[PDB]
Design a protein around this ligand. Structure first.
Ligand code: F1P
Ligand code: F1P
Lengths: 324, 325
């Protein structure tokens, strides 16, 4: 089901737009927003917090358990809205977190659930997934909320059709991605991204980790030179995700190749940075631009998993919903 | 070899830090809104400082230098009353580039007079000198020096340096125990876990293992690990749980990892048996200083694992002591 779900990304964008239009005039997102989630939903929370800041607001993201047990170490301050993100809407930690919150609560989930019952409003984006690994729901949740955020902040709406078609372009790379997995049997991998693409790198790494029971890491693009690069050699694939690369990116690619690693560049640029593999995606509004990158990293993780005889639908030791 | 010698200078580093603090305490006033910038281990130290700043009623945010340089708009920086640039060498290009773009007051934290100190309004020069490419005792020394300055600035009483230094001497007493774990359980990957102030310590611990042993190491906020990340832990994995005051969930988590076949080392300030295979109890200190004794433990673990693999922690492959552009 994992592959089928990744391929439903284009439709997920359309479903998200529909939900946005249904609730847009029922809730107005404020300036100070706290985002809470676990696992992939935490990485989505980080992404939402980032785009909130990008558009002039003040967003902070924290893992549910850190809010539950160590909130004093985080710069939360006054919260005008608390957003709880949970694909299942049943994760014990998010429910525990929200019951401690008194301010307005907005839930983001795929279904009517325990979560929606404890929130004042909710974005129920029906990007249903049977797989334990979150795929198109991440992308769909992001778009639905982004539309709502832009709307609340007085910005023009994004073109859902254009963005959905952009993800169809990402899916055209399926065979090429399969070829990467077939031609280079990497033993570990590093995902790199800056700004909005950093949370995407974190999510990408988790996809690879869950689906492939793999050694995968993720870092803000240039932070990797600070010790982290020591574990990259001829058995490593480095995935650099960048919208508009500059000289430092070319130097970084060269640096990794000098260590023997192979480099895959996913960008919105026609520039040759010296990469071994290249995936060019349609450039969109800066805030929506990360969307087409998700299906690419999801497909890469899926095919690497299959190449190891693993079942991405039900990774060993994992539960679909973490409960306590 | 200098790495082990440097790890063992942790106790003295605390004393050196206290001396610097007392020399500059009335020359530097720390504000409410502070931005912390650093790279690599210095970034993880920045996260720790930002957290303790929040813990004490201030507003601290930490960012890797390059993210501030090229993607600051995606972060909740807001109004900055002070920018703190952390760099052991004081020569990292990214920190120099970051600070020159800032107009507000700038404080540097480094081990030596350098390019960094020359562009800051003032600096905490803590002479915890290190020849190893891997940062060790300078991390805790920098932390203590600033922590004292923060407490003083915020009207709180001073921490007892001698007591904290002694606490790290207790950490070092576990050297044999740690060496023997490395010699008996040949783990192939490792996961460090910590919450609150111990999360940045887990991040730093993981980097120490990564740099010193060219190892597969990961770090996560304690309970976040159940959310998919735990899939890579099995009988070849050592899970290191760092916790000051464990409760019911910690015992359950330890048991969950053992059920996957992994062995668990618990480093805590509690005598409670959570079911761990290995146990290291450290002296409990003031909440803000409590993380200090944990550093030499993880540094020693990374060092011995490196030696067991015939690797030289002083000069990890591919690494430059100072990253320049
Ligand atoms: O709170 P949710 O978004 O339902 O889910 C959070 C999550 O960590 O739960 C356990 C696993 O299924 C993970 O793959 C998933 O991302
Ligand atoms: O800015 P600094 O704190 O000098 O150093 C930052 C750092 O990443 O530089 C490269 C290596 O030596 C690393 O071990 C070190 O932590």
């Amino acid at each position: 089901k994992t592959l089928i779900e990744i391929k439903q990304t284009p439709d997920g964008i359309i479903k998200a737009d529909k939900v946005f239009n249904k609730v847009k005039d029922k809730i107005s997102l404020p300036n100070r927003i706290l985002y809470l989630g676990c696992g992939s939903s935490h990485f989505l929370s980080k992404l939402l917090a980032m785009v909130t800041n990008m558009h002039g607001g003040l967003g902070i993201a924290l893992p549910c358990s850190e809010f539950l047990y160590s909130k004093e170490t985080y710069p939360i301050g006054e919260v005008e809205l608390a957003v709880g993100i949970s694909r299942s809407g049943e994760t014990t930690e998010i429910l525990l977190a929200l019951e401690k919150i008194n301010v307005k609560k907005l839930g983001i989930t795929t279904r009517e659930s325990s979560l929606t019952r404890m929130c004042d409003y909710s974005l129920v984006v029906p990007a249903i997934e049977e797989s334990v690994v979150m795929t198109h729901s991440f992308t769909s949740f992001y778009f639905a909320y982004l539309q709502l955020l832009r709307y609340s902040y007085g910005l023009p709406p994004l073109n859902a059709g254009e963005i959905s078609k952009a993800t169809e372009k990402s899916l055209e790379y399926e065979r090429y991605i399969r070829e990467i997995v077939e031609s280079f049997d990497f033993q570990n991998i590093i995902f790199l991204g800056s700004g909005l693409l950093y949370p995407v790198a974190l999510e990408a790494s988790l996809k690879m980790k869950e689906m492939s029971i793999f050694w995968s890491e993720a870092y803000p693009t240039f932070e990797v030179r600070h010790g982290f690069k020591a574990i990259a050699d001829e058995k490593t694939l480095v995935v650099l995700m960048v919208e508009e690369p500059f000289e430092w990116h070319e130097k970084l690619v060269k640096e990794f190749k000098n260590q023997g690693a192979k480099v895959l560049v996913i960008s919105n640029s026609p520039q040759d940075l010296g990469q071994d593999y290249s995936i060019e995606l349609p450039r969109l509004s800066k805030d929506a631009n990360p969307i087409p990158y998700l299906p690419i990293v999801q497909l890469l993780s899926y095919y690497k998993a299959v190449s190891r005889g693993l079942n991405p639908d039900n990774p060993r030791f994992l539960d679909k919903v973490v409960r306590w």
